[PDB]
């Protein structure tokens, strides 16, 4: 009877019920497809795990907004009926759209959600607004760092100021790609687990005794790249770190480090590389994270700037890096006028960062007034899909 909070994340989809404190549903957004020499897709991590011939890795969020409508429906069709199995006709829904979503995309999304799934009520909100609500604020600056799109969204009274949005592509994907390139410097082949089933006490700085699963079919370049990206991302989260000050060849370099064994067992305790890689979004022609934030705040009215300078909220899958918030605080303190008191809200755990938009959707979906502010099925009837524009800000 409760509402469903669907956060279609850049690279991981988050879903769950209105009152739940975390999304019980979560699976990578990437999906596979192949056509008759059928277009049925494969969803969820477990299905994608199985290698298959001419099976791609299609992501319906290339531009942040929904780019592949059939793929987006397929994921929504899968998630509704399998992961959060329940009839669509009975549950009201909350959808988290990107801050800069194109109007036509919103209209098409509403038309699909209503007609195809016949849901009774509906509401579309911006992920930045949901993050601000989740953190417990109506005015602030939300720095989102997901996949392929990092943006600094200033919100005033729960309304996203499109004036001050700065879109930076130095998102999590870029960092992971740099991770691939910095082990072209270590000269280690990137081999995914799905090919590797063997382990041994392989010496440090020594190629491993890895053996392949021989009978698997020839894999597509897309899914192999997708499997390598997952490997480096799992490595990325647990290894990378943001230096407190801009890296300048510390004592030996960074003193002892993590001895993170790759899927092939072998590895060398990563040195300065784990510090250089995260700085890709601090020392990039493009604009750094602090540059993005200052340009965004400097772009909006002076009166609200003190509200933003001091209410800067960080929430994004890429932001979950050690001491990232620390370096951001230092950088923004240096560039902010000293007479302004900057402050970052301590919400650094994985649940508060990654699922922040979903947490906000849960908070909004639970309010008693949510009944009046959504889009009724009757309103869809006599009022066309255009009602999504007026009923959602």
């Amino acid at each position: 009877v409760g509402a469903l909070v669907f956060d279609i994340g850049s690279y991981t989809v988050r879903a769950g019920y209105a009152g739940e404190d975390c999304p019980k549903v979560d699976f990578p957004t990437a999906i596979g497809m192949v056509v008759e020499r059928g277009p049925t897709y494969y969803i969820d991590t477990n299905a994608l795990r199985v290698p298959r011939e001419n099976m791609e890795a299609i992501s319906p969020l290339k531009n942040g907004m929904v780019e592949d409508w059939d793929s987006f429906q397929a994921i929504l069709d899968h998630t509704y009926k399998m992961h959060v199995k329940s009839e669509a006709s009975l549950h009201p829904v909350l959808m988290s759209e990107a801050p800069w979503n194109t109007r036509a995309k919103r209209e098409k999304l509403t038309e699909l959600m209503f007609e195809h799934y016949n849901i009774p009520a509906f509401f579309l909100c911006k992920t930045a607004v949901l993050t601000a609500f989740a953190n417990g604020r109506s005015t602030g600056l939300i720095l989102d760092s997901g996949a392929t799109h990092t943006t600094a969204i200033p919100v005033h009274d729960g309304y996203v100021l499109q004036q001050g949005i700065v879109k930076s592509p130095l998102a999590g994907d870029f960092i992971t790609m740099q991770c691939r390139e910095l082990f072209q410097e270590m000269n280690i082949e990137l081999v995914p687990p799905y090919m590797i089933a063997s382990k041994e006490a392989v010496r440090e700085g020594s190629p491993a005794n890895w053996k392949r699963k021989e009978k698997l079919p020839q894999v597509t370049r897309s899914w192999h790249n997708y499997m390598c990206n997952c490997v480096i991302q799992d490595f990325q989260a647990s290894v990378l770190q943001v230096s407190d000050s801009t890296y300048d060849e510390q004592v030996a370099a960074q003193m002892p480090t993590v001895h993170y064994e790759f899927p092939n067992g072998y590895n060398c305790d990563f040195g300065a590389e784990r510090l250089k890689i995260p700085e890709g979004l601090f020392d990039p022609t493009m604009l750094g994270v602090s540059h993005v934030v200052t340009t965004s705040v400097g772009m909006c009215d002076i009166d609200i700037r003190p509200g933003l300078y001091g209410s800067v909220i960080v929430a994004g899958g890429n932001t979950l890096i050690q001491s990232f918030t620390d370096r951001l605080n230092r950088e923004l303190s240096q560039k902010t006028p000293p007479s302004m008191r900057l402050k970052l809200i301590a919400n650094n755990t994985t649940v508060e960062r990654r699922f922040s938009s979903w947490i906000g959707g849960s908070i909004l979906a639970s309010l008693g007034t949510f009944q009046q502010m959504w889009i009724s099925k009757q309103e869809y009837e006599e009022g066309g899909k255009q009602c999504v524009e007026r009923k959602c800000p």
Side-chain angles (χ1 to χ4, degrees):
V1 57
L4 292 157
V5 176
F6 286 109
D7 194 90
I8 308 298
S10 41
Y11 93 122
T12 51
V13 169
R14 294 83 71 93
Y17 290 99
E20 300 267 39
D21 81 339
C22 89
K24 62 164 202 164
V25 169
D26 178 9
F27 55 109
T29 323
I31 66 186
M33 158 152 176
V34 60
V35 184
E36 156 61 315
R37 314 281 91 181
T40 51
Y41 285 73
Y42 315 123
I43 328 294
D44 271 48
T45 291
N46 67 332
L48 288 191
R49 186 265 155 194
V50 158
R52 266 151 295 195
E53 66 59 44
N54 279 2
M55 144 214 83
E56 334 319 337
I58 294 207
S59 303
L61 304 177
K62 186 190 83 198
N63 196 358
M65 309 104 64
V66 176
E67 184 53 286
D68 196 355
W69 280 127
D70 282 351
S71 308
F72 164 90
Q73 183 188 153
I75 178 174
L76 279 204
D77 205 70
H78 154 87
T79 196
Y80 261 84
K81 307 318 301 289
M82 303 315 266
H83 222 256
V84 62
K85 53 231 298 179
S86 192
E87 288 187 343
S89 311
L90 76 89
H91 268 295
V93 193
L94 194 160
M95 286 285 318
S96 80
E97 62 167 8
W100 61 88
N101 265 97
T102 307
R103 82 182 279 275
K105 260 56 208 292
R106 324 178 79 209
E107 275 139 22
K108 178 60 167 316
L109 167 56
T110 299
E111 164 270 11
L112 172 68
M113 201 85 238
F114 266 116
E115 287 211 44
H116 191 63
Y117 293 133
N118 288 289
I119 48 164
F122 183 50
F123 192 64
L124 243 181
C125 191
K126 316 221 199 314
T127 54
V129 180
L130 298 174
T131 298
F133 293 174
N135 180 200
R137 240 168 283 271
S138 34
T139 293
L141 187 139
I142 303 99
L143 175 93
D144 264 18
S145 318
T148 317
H149 304 297
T150 281
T151 58
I153 311 100
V155 305
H156 188 234
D157 292 328
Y159 183 65
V160 162
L161 284 171
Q162 308 269 329
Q163 167 188 47
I165 273 180
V166 169
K167 187 164 171 284
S168 178
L170 306 200
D173 266 1
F174 161 61
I175 303 292
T176 52
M177 301 145 68
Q178 177 154 17
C179 269
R180 207 203 316 284
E181 305 333 299
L182 235 185
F183 326 132
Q184 300 319 268
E185 160 283 302
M186 302 285 216
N187 289 245
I188 183 56
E189 181 171 26
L190 181 36
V191 186
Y194 96 89
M195 269 160 44
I196 307 156
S198 67
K199 302 290 283 268
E200 294 195 326
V202 292
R203 173 170 296 93
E204 178 181 315
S206 310
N209 180 6
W210 90 268
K211 180 58 42 149
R212 199 216 313 170
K213 294 189 176 182
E214 315 181 324
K215 299 188 182 180
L216 311 181
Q218 297 293 352
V219 294
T220 60
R221 184 71 221 180
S222 186
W223 189 76
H224 178 70
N225 167 20
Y226 147 104
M227 269 299 302
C228 293
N229 283 0
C230 313
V231 155
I232 213 68
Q233 214 290 339
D234 287 87
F235 143 68
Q236 173 242 46
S238 195
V239 174
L240 301 213
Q241 151 192 350
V242 188
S243 180
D244 320 294
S245 177
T246 326
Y247 187 82
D248 44 359
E249 288 287 52
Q250 326 318 128
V251 181
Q254 75 303 310
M255 310 279 76
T257 50
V258 54
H259 185 342
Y260 183 106
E261 302 181 346
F262 292 120
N264 62 22
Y266 143 84
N267 80 292
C268 91
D269 64 289
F270 263 110
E273 285 73 317
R274 71 197 272 276
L275 304 104
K276 310 319 287 282
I277 292 156
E279 285 206 330
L281 49 55
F282 291 119
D283 173 27
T285 304
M286 277 190 244
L287 313 86
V289 169
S290 63
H291 289 78
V292 159
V293 172
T294 183
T295 54
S296 211
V297 174
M299 245 163 214
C300 40
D301 306 328
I302 180 171
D303 280 333
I304 66 168
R305 291 192 194 163
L308 308 180
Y309 269 10
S311 314
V312 173
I313 302 162
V314 182
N318 176 247
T319 37
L320 282 159
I321 297 178
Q322 154 164 350
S323 46
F324 178 93
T325 182
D326 153 45
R327 193 244 165 80
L328 191 53
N329 192 347
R330 303 302 286 292
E331 256 199 354
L332 278 169
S333 183
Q334 203 144 320
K335 297 211 283 196
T336 293
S339 197
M340 191 65 68
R341 323 293 156 64
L342 256 180
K343 190 48 52 181
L344 282 293
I345 318 84
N347 51 349
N348 81 334
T349 65
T350 55
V351 62
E352 320 145 4
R353 292 283 249 257
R354 270 167 48 64
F355 308 136
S356 203
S357 58
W358 190 98
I359 301 300
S362 88
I363 282 155
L364 171 52
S366 182
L367 297 188
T369 54
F370 185 65
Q371 190 288 328
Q372 76 216 76
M373 56 181 97
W374 68 37
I375 301 159
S376 170
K377 202 163 86 76
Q378 314 153 291
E379 222 170 343
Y380 184 104
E381 182 78 349
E382 312 89 11
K385 40 158 185 61
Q386 302 170 334
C387 72
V388 74
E389 308 280 44
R390 272 172 277 105
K391 196 76 76 169
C392 298

